[PDB]
Enzyme design. Structure first.
Site, mmCIF file in Angstrom:
data_model
loop_
_atom_site.group_PDB
_atom_site.id
_atom_site.type_symbol
_atom_site.label_atom_id
_atom_site.label_comp_id
_atom_site.label_asym_id
_atom_site.label_seq_id
_atom_site.Cartn_x
_atom_site.Cartn_y
_atom_site.Cartn_z
ATOM 1 N N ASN A 173 -12.178 15.404 -68.509
ATOM 2 C CA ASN A 173 -11.808 15.265 -69.910
ATOM 3 C C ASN A 173 -10.464 15.901 -70.194
ATOM 4 O O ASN A 173 -10.164 17.050 -69.794
ATOM 5 C CB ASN A 173 -12.935 15.980 -70.725
ATOM 6 N N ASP B 276 -11.970 10.712 -70.858
ATOM 7 C CA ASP B 276 -12.408 11.094 -69.538
ATOM 8 C C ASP B 276 -11.762 10.148 -68.489
ATOM 9 O O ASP B 276 -11.750 8.940 -68.674
ATOM 10 C CB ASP B 276 -13.951 10.976 -69.398
ATOM 11 N N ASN C 145 -13.702 9.481 -75.601
ATOM 12 C CA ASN C 145 -14.742 10.289 -76.207
ATOM 13 C C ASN C 145 -14.660 10.171 -77.745
ATOM 14 O O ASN C 145 -13.601 9.989 -78.330
ATOM 15 C CB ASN C 145 -14.596 11.742 -75.743
ATOM 16 N N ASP D 90 -14.470 12.510 -79.950
ATOM 17 C CA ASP D 90 -13.453 13.412 -80.506
ATOM 18 C C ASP D 90 -12.004 12.955 -80.323
ATOM 19 O O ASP D 90 -11.126 13.631 -80.795
ATOM 20 C CB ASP D 90 -13.635 14.842 -79.999
ATOM 21 N N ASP E 1 -16.308 27.240 -63.978
ATOM 22 C CA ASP E 1 -15.961 27.707 -65.337
ATOM 23 C C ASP E 1 -17.073 28.478 -66.032
ATOM 24 O O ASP E 1 -16.829 29.045 -67.093
ATOM 25 C CB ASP E 1 -15.609 26.508 -66.235
ATOM 26 N N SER F 233 -10.501 12.646 -77.231
ATOM 27 C CA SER F 233 -10.114 12.952 -75.866
ATOM 28 C C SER F 233 -10.544 11.749 -75.001
ATOM 29 O O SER F 233 -11.257 10.876 -75.500
ATOM 30 C CB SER F 233 -10.745 14.237 -75.343
ATOM 31 N N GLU G 254 -21.105 8.785 -63.742
ATOM 32 C CA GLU G 254 -19.881 9.000 -64.534
ATOM 33 C C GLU G 254 -18.995 7.774 -64.468
ATOM 34 O O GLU G 254 -18.433 7.325 -65.496
ATOM 35 C CB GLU G 254 -19.153 10.252 -64.046
#
Ligand SMILES: [Cl-]
Ligand SMILES: [Cl-]
Ligand SMILES: [Cl-]
Ligand SMILES: [Cl-]
Ligand SMILES: [Cl-]
Ligand SMILES: [Cu+2]
Ligand SMILES: [Cu+2]
Ligand code: NA
Length: 129
Positions: free
Chosen positions: A59, A52, A46, A48, A101, A50, A35
């Protein structure tokens, strides 16, 4: 802060990640390597829009607030900048929420594509923890 491999393993263990939700320490170390290359200051945009943040690339779409991710949530109730600290506490605590989650570590696509199924113990081999 750029951690060394065993230094981060030891820190993540201190912070309660070893076997958290059933994921052994090497899983967390492997995820952090791919990562962030063990760099707490890592940031990546990202597709979209967003971003990280930090050692585990958390995110802003869901987990932290950066003020520039429309329609996103802040489920860890933290500024995303907190995730870039040399102190991994915020990252770890937020990661605990993420992995709980429902999809476990599959939340981290790099974990799924690069760590899952592999000999993740190799990541802590030889480490004084
Ligand atoms: Cl390494
Ligand atoms: Cl392991
Ligand atoms: Cl936002
Ligand atoms: Cl720390
Ligand atoms: Cl799971
Ligand atoms: Cu600590
Ligand atoms: Cu230790
Ligand atoms: Na957000």
């Amino acid at each position: 802060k750029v951690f060394g491999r065993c230094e981060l393993a030891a820190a993540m263990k201190r912070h309660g990640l070893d076997n958290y939700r059933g994921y052994s320490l090497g899983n967390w170390v492997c995820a952090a390597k791919f990562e962030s290359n063990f760099n707490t200051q890592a940031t990546n945009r990202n597709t979209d829009g967003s971003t990280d943040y930090g050692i585990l690339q958390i995110n802003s779409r869901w987990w932290c607030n950066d003020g520039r991710t429309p329609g996103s949530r802040n489920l860890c109730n933290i500024p995303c900048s907190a995730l870039l600290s040399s102190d991994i506490t915020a990252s770890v605590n937020c990661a605990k929420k993420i992995v709980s989650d429902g999809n476990g570590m599959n939340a981290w696509v790099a974990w799924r594509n690069r760590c899952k199924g592999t000999d993740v113990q190799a990541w802590i081999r030889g480490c004084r923890l």
